[model samples]
Structure formats: C-alpha cells, structure tokens
Target: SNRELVVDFLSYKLSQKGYSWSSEAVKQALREAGDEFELRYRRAFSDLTSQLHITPGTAYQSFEQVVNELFRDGVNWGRIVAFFSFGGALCVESVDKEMQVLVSRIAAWMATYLNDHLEPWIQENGGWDTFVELYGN
Candidate 1:
C-alpha cells in the first residue's frame, strides 16, 4: 500500500490525461494527493533511520518523546523549533512548483503535530516540575 501510494505520487502518471485543465488545479490536486498519500504511509516513514544526535526512537517517535529528549538536557525547544523550522524553510525551497500556498499549512500542521504528540511527553516525564528541575524554569 505504501509503495503503491508513493508510486502514484512520484510517478505523476495520472490515470487520465487533463489536457484542458488549469495548472492551479493540477498543483492543488498534486498537493492534496501527496499529503493524503503521506498520511497513509507515514508509519513507514518511521523506518527511515537517522544517524544524527537523535534517533527515531527519540525524534520522530512521538511529539512528547521528541520534546522530552530536547529538554532532557536543557530548555532546547527554541533550538529544536528553529532547526526544524529551518528544515521547513528548506522544504519550501526544495519544491519546484507553485506550492507556496502549502507553507502556512505545513507550519500549522507541524505545530499541531508537536503539541498533540509532545504535551503527553511532558506529563509522562514527571510534568513541568521535573522539567524545571532538569533545566531550571
């Protein structure tokens, strides 16, 4: 299923030709399809391992896990957000199309995802009391 969805997105060989369609419509459809395809295959994305300071078990595992790891050593949220935000900016640069519309959506989604996944992490790791102890409030 993941491969099938990815092939559909990457191949761009649509089932039918849109000879008289508008570029805007095509781009919109492409983004929608890509987003949906990614959501469905997102679990597979976890398999993509990184050799950086953080492991998937820490970084992409969940928002809370990520936040905990960030603050595990100190109040690193600014550094974390900035680094990922920069990556987000680079993502915009990497797109070779009229996808400027998706930038805001991407940022909002990142925030939502982070909050949803990370808040629980704080609770699990002894809440703010522990956080302050670890990094000083």
Candidate 2:
C-alpha cells in the first residue's frame, strides 16, 4: 500500500479525523486523500516536477537535500503541504525514471522526515488532527 505509505508522511487529508492510524475506513480515506492531495499538489506545483531528479541510489539523501532547501525558511502549513507535494513529485520521478520500486524508499524517507523533523511542528501547531480540519474535506 504505497498510497498509504506516502500519505503516512505526506500530510494528506485525514483519513480518520482523529489520526489514530488503523482502520479500513482510514485506509480507504487515505486512498482518496493521497490521490486528491497529489493531484492538487502536482497541479499547483507545476514547476517542481522537472526540477526533481531521482538518484536511484541514496534516494533518501537526494530527497533530503531538496526538501531541506524547501523548508529551510520555515514550516507553516503551506510549507508542510508543499513537503507532501515534494514527496509526490519525487514518487512521480521514481516512476518516470522507470524505477517504480523506488517509491517504497521514497515514502520511507518522507515518513522519516515527517515524523522526525515535521512532527514537532505539527505538535506545536496542534497536531495532524488540526491539519485535517484545515486541509481535509
């Protein structure tokens, strides 16, 4: 479930409004959440897809550099959403390079960044639950 895997970090529309993490309802919710958010991101962020180049190996590091440049300034909700946008764009590049399997690691990297770097910000703001309210449907 790479869809679930990516959104696990991508700040998708909350599958469960509460963020508890397990339930078929949430899984299905994440399915659409992932699709919808990526659609919005790719559309809104038309310029970035081409800028992202997948390194095949050291995929995490490549993502780190790009996202690091992305959030170097700050971590507001827009930046957070853009981080997810960045992840989806990389996923597209992973497939664009015809190395689709790289998606797993891409998401894994995003999950780590989301959990480690962005988790504190979300906590400070009011948790992913609040993000769901602001960004979710």
Candidate 3:
C-alpha cells in the first residue's frame, strides 16, 4: 500500500509535467530504496509532523520552514523520492488526518521541485526514459 502510494504520487507528478515512465521503473527505484530506508524515513516524517504540529490544512510556508531546517544540507532527486515515500508510508501506516495532509504537501513540494530543478536536469541528461535507465535497472 505504501509502495503503491509512492508510485501513484510520483506518477501523478510526472504526468502533470507531461512525462511518463514504466511501472517497472518505479518499482525498481522503490526496491532499491528497501524496507529499511522506508522505515527510517517514515519515522522521520512522523516525528516531524509531531514536532511541528502539522494539521490537515497547514500552510505551505509552515511546511517549507521545517523542511528547510530538516534538510539544511540541501536535497537531490534521491532524497526527494525518499521524502515522498516517507509521506506515503505515513499514510498507509497511520490513520491520522494530518498524515494525509502531510502526504499531499510533500507531494506538492516534490512535484514543484521536480519541475523546477530535476526535470531540467533529466531533460538535459536525456529525458525520463534515459534517467530511469541509469536510475534503476
């Protein structure tokens, strides 16, 4: 369920940008991340939600502040995927309303980042197909 949520969110994102990739590519990336990675990040996201008092309708500004602090060193494509997967896992494992909001916000931020940064890099590096070729199997 968590894995599907991750794939769904990512698929939605790419589709929004008029990009597409195979389901196998998505699975390969998640498989590479592994259960341990998902577990750690899920905990991190839950802790973040608690520490920040995030609500279902929390503003993006509030989300932005905490995430910047949490990722003070900066982030890249891999880290961004982990962040989305964390939110997805939170949704599957927790029934909290705030967790769903967190997932939406995380996906929003990720989609924005992908469009602004990663997409361009991906285009330059040879588009989604080639990116997935090197990114996964």
Candidate 4:
C-alpha cells in the first residue's frame, strides 16, 4: 500500500513541481506499485459544471475558472459538461427514440473512471481545500 501511495505521490509530483508528468511514467509506476485509484474527479468536474445538464443547475460560481479547465478546451462546443452530456442524449434519441441509453452509458463511463482513478488522490491529499493545504510547497 505504501508503494502505491509513494508511486502515486511521485507521479503527481511532476505536476505539482510545475513540470509535465509523463503518462508513460504514471502508467509504469501504477503497474509496478499496484495501487488502483478510485476516481472522484468525475463528480468534482460534474459539480463544477452542473449548470450544463439537461435540467439546469447553478452555473459554476466563477465563469473564468470554468473556462480555464483543460477539458473545456477539448470539448469546444459548450461551457458545460451537462450540455455535452445532454447533446449526446439528443443525438442518440433522434434515432433510438430514447435518451436513457445515452445517459446510462455516459454515467457509467463517468462512474468507472472516477472509481478507478480519482478518489485515491483525494483521500491521500485530503479533500479540496485551500492550495496551501493541498500543496505544501
């Protein structure tokens, strides 16, 4: 367990150090350390972009912060994940006549990802808080 924790901490260390952490190293270390991550980031990103969902919610409190996300750049169609999620549903429904499949698939993908990768980092580092608390440097 310590090996996993150490490997994970080291993998992310590059990012924290303000350098790019190579995916290869991250994968290799994970394979060696055998620390499987339980992801929580899908939920976090969903919470941050909740307003984009089909049933709208409050927009991310800070527009600028939302815009600054790396994922946002890739999905250039909208400012909200919900919008993208909804769009998938719409596209599927146009032919399938149902939206549940799309929603379920997306939700399942989101669930598996966070369960596999994001939750561990949160648990070890502590929940989101001030930068000083998360990053001791």
The backbone clash count of each candidate, in order, is 3, 0, 0, 9
Tens digits of lDDT, candidate 4, 51-92: 443311222222223334534444321222232232232323
- Candidate 1 per-residue lDDT, tens place, 91-129, comes to 333232344343333344445544665456646667534
For each candidate, C-alpha RMSD in Å?
Answer: 16.3, 6.9, 7.9, 16.2
Runs in model 3 lying further than 4 Å from the true structure: 1-23, 31-36, 40-46, 57-59, 66-75, 89-95, 98-109, 125-131, 134-137
Candidate number achieving the greatest TM-score relative to the actual structure:
2
Model 2 lDDT tens row, 18-125? 222223443444445556656676655566666656677767777888789888988887676666656766765666577767766767777778777887887899
Worst 10 residues of 3 by lDDT: 89-98
Candidate rank order under lDDT? 2, 3, 1, 4
Q: Tell me the lDDT of model 1 at 31.
A: 37
Model 2: residue 116 alpha-carbon error in angstroms = 1.1
Q: How much is the lDDT of residue 39 in candidate 2?
A: 69
TM-score of each: 0.28, 0.67, 0.51, 0.25
- Model 1 earns a TM-score of 0.28
Residue pairs in steric clash, candidate 2?
none
lDDT of 3 at 56: 57
Global local distance difference test of model 2? 0.63
Q: After superposition, how far is residue 130 of candidate 3 from its true place, in Å?
A: 5.0
In candidate 3, list every pair of residues with a backbone clash.
none
Point out the higher-scoring one by TM-score: 2 or 3. Answer: 2
How much does candidate 4 score in TM-score?
A: 0.25
Candidate No. with top lDDT: 2
